[PDB]
Write an enzyme that holds these catalytic residues in place. Structure first.
Site, PDB file in Angstrom:
ATOM      1  N   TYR A 167       0.840  -1.180   0.000  1.00 14.59           N
ATOM      2  CA  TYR A 167       0.000   0.000   0.000  1.00 14.59           C
ATOM      3  C   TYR A 167       0.879   1.235   0.000  1.00 14.59           C
ATOM      4  O   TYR A 167       1.217   1.772   1.055  1.00 14.59           O
ATOM      5  CB  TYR A 167      -0.899   0.007   1.232  1.00 14.59           C
ATOM      6  N   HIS A 215      -4.286  -0.432  -2.411  1.00 15.28           N
ATOM      7  CA  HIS A 215      -5.471   0.420  -2.336  1.00 15.28           C
ATOM      8  C   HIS A 215      -6.674  -0.153  -3.075  1.00 15.28           C
ATOM      9  O   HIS A 215      -7.736   0.461  -3.075  1.00 15.28           O
ATOM     10  CB  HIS A 215      -5.173   1.809  -2.906  1.00 15.28           C
ATOM     11  N   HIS A 219     -13.320  -3.771   1.604  1.00 17.29           N
ATOM     12  CA  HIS A 219     -13.589  -4.099   2.998  1.00 17.29           C
ATOM     13  C   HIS A 219     -14.493  -5.316   3.230  1.00 17.29           C
ATOM     14  O   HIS A 219     -15.316  -5.687   2.391  1.00 17.29           O
ATOM     15  CB  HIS A 219     -14.186  -2.872   3.705  1.00 17.29           C
ATOM     16  N   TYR A 227      -3.906  -5.165   7.345  1.00 22.21           N
ATOM     17  CA  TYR A 227      -2.892  -4.206   6.930  1.00 22.21           C
ATOM     18  C   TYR A 227      -1.706  -4.437   7.861  1.00 22.21           C
ATOM     19  O   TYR A 227      -1.878  -4.583   9.071  1.00 22.21           O
ATOM     20  CB  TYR A 227      -3.391  -2.778   7.103  1.00 22.21           C
ATOM     21  N   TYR A 257     -11.430  -2.391   7.296  1.00 27.75           N
ATOM     22  CA  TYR A 257     -11.026  -0.985   7.342  1.00 27.75           C
ATOM     23  C   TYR A 257     -11.084  -0.493   8.786  1.00 27.75           C
ATOM     24  O   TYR A 257     -11.837  -1.025   9.601  1.00 27.75           O
ATOM     25  CB  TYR A 257     -11.953  -0.130   6.465  1.00 27.75           C
TER      26      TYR A 257
HETATM   27  C1  LIG Z   1      -9.397   1.547  -0.769  1.00 29.90           C
HETATM   28  S1  LIG Z   1     -10.697   1.567  -2.015  1.00 29.90           S
HETATM   29  C2  LIG Z   1     -10.655  -0.266  -2.376  1.00 29.90           C
HETATM   30  C3  LIG Z   1     -10.836  -0.334  -3.916  1.00 29.90           C
HETATM   31  C4  LIG Z   1     -12.018   0.364  -4.673  1.00 29.90           C
HETATM   32  N1  LIG Z   1     -13.243  -0.415  -4.490  1.00 29.90           N
HETATM   33  C5  LIG Z   1     -11.634   0.661  -6.117  1.00 29.90           C
HETATM   34  O1  LIG Z   1     -12.346   0.269  -7.051  1.00 29.90           O
HETATM   35  O2  LIG Z   1     -10.591   1.305  -6.368  1.00 29.90           O
HETATM   36  C6  LIG Z   1     -12.152   2.164  -0.995  1.00 29.90           C
HETATM   37  C7  LIG Z   1     -13.472   2.332  -1.658  1.00 29.90           C
HETATM   38  O3  LIG Z   1     -13.984   1.094  -2.200  1.00 29.90           O
HETATM   39  C8  LIG Z   1     -15.399   0.928  -1.893  1.00 29.90           C
HETATM   40  N2  LIG Z   1     -15.323  -0.208  -0.956  1.00 29.90           N
HETATM   41  C9  LIG Z   1     -14.456  -0.980  -0.136  1.00 29.90           C
HETATM   42  N3  LIG Z   1     -15.005  -1.958   0.524  1.00 29.90           N
HETATM   43  C10 LIG Z   1     -16.345  -1.897   0.168  1.00 29.90           C
HETATM   44  C11 LIG Z   1     -17.524  -2.691   0.533  1.00 29.90           C
HETATM   45  N4  LIG Z   1     -17.482  -3.731   1.375  1.00 29.90           N
HETATM   46  N5  LIG Z   1     -18.784  -2.349  -0.025  1.00 29.90           N
HETATM   47  C12 LIG Z   1     -18.884  -1.286  -0.896  1.00 29.90           C
HETATM   48  N6  LIG Z   1     -17.869  -0.466  -1.320  1.00 29.90           N
HETATM   49  C13 LIG Z   1     -16.585  -0.834  -0.736  1.00 29.90           C
HETATM   50  C14 LIG Z   1     -15.876   2.418  -1.869  1.00 29.90           C
HETATM   51  O4  LIG Z   1     -15.946   3.500  -2.695  1.00 29.90           O
HETATM   52  C15 LIG Z   1     -14.694   2.824  -0.888  1.00 29.90           C
HETATM   53  O5  LIG Z   1     -14.412   4.083  -0.354  1.00 29.90           O
END
Ligand SMILES: C[S@@+](CC[C@H](N)C(=O)[O-])C[C@H]1O[C@@H](n2cnc3c(N)ncnc32)[C@H](O)[C@@H]1O
Length: 283
Positions: A167, A215, A219, A227, A257
């Site tokens: 990360y 990244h 979650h 992490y 998270y």
């Molecule tokens: C660190 S990013 C992980 C990757 C991201 N989903 C992407 O396409 O780049 C964090 C974001 O992913 C989504 N995300 C992560 N875990 C999720 C879950 N269990 N349900 C829905 N959205 C999730 C939302 O927009 C969130 O703020």
């Protein structure tokens, strides 16, 4: 702190030596000559990676044949290092270890990796140069989770405690993250008490940034990864994604998270999280 098992000859360290950290973990194996590190030595990092090579006159990792070895103890960045810092490393494989001495075989291609710690605005000098260890373990694809964008997937089956992804990202203060528009915090990850790692907008797209892919991990309240701290030869001090248990090939990697007591927990959790949290509680 920590024990240093040494071999002495008239007051000074002379011969084989092994050092451990307070936790009793082997952090060094090699030898000394007149109280200075001598010959081919191994420096082991808590995260599983390590440094090995013919040390110089001052006992430091400076040479043209130094190597950083990833946690799989196979993937390596072999080349020029100055006092442990990767100046010009080339991808290679640790073929064998002959009497403590490693044998490296370069991989096809001449891409050069170097210490390139990010700043508050520059995420990398080669945003599109992938991490070779990551290339072997993970890949990005539509998350299996509904309406969750992209997710991170394991390329092969691996056991528990395996480092899968890194990360990396720009480094900013907690103050800046807590005071700015929260809509800009989808990728912020706390590194420590004074630094937050972020993969700001443009770079959240694999077509613009593929140097690290941590990244992309979504979650889960029943995650299969966590992490973890990591000291990368290219990125420097960052966080990584490590499995909590064995994972199948093509299994989606997820992490819980971070969402401390009320008030001292920073900004509120996103709407999608709160929803799933309730659905989870008493599932
Ligand atoms: C660190 S990013 C992980 C990757 C991201 N989903 C992407 O396409 O780049 C964090 C974001 O992913 C989504 N995300 C992560 N875990 C999720 C879950 N269990 N349900 C829905 N959205 C999730 C939302 O927009 C969130 O703020």
């Amino acid at each position: 702190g920590g024990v240093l098992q040494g071999t002495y000859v008239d007051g000074e360290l002379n011969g084989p030596a092994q050092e451990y950290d307070t936790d009793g973990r082997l952090i060094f194996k090699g030898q000394y000559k007149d109280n200075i590190r001598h010959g081919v030595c191994w420096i082991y990092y808590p995260d599983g990676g390590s440094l090995v090579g013919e040390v110089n006159e001052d006992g430091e990792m400076t040479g043209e044949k130094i190597a950083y070895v990833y946690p799989d103890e196979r993937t390596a960045l072999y080349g020029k290092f100055i006092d442990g810092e990767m100046i010009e490393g080339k991808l290679a494989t640790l073929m064998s270890t002959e009497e403590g001495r490693p044998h490296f075989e370069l991989m096809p291609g001449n891409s050069v990796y170097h210490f390139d710690k990010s700043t508050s605005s520059c995420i990398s000098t080669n945003a599109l140069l992938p991490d070779p260890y990551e290339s072997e373990r993970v890949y990005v694809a539509e998350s299996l989770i509904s309406s969750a964008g992209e997710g991170l997937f394991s390329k092969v089956a691996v056991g528990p405690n395996t480092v899968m992804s890194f990360y990396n990202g720009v480094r900013i203060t907690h103050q800046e993250v807590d005071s700015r528009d929260w809509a800009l915090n989808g990728n912020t990850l706390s590194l420590d008490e004074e630094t937050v790692i972020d993969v700001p907008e443009p770079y959240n797209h694999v077509s613009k940034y593929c140097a690290s892919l941590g990244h992309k991990a979504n979650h889960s309240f029943t995650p299969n990864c966590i992490y973890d701290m990591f000291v990368h030869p290219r990125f420097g001090p960052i966080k990584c994604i490590r499995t909590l248990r064995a994972v199948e090939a093509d299994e989606e990697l997820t992490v819980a998270y971070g969402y401390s007591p009320p008030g001292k927990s920073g900004p509120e959790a996103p709407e999608w999280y709160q929803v799933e949290l309730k659905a989870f509680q008493a599932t």
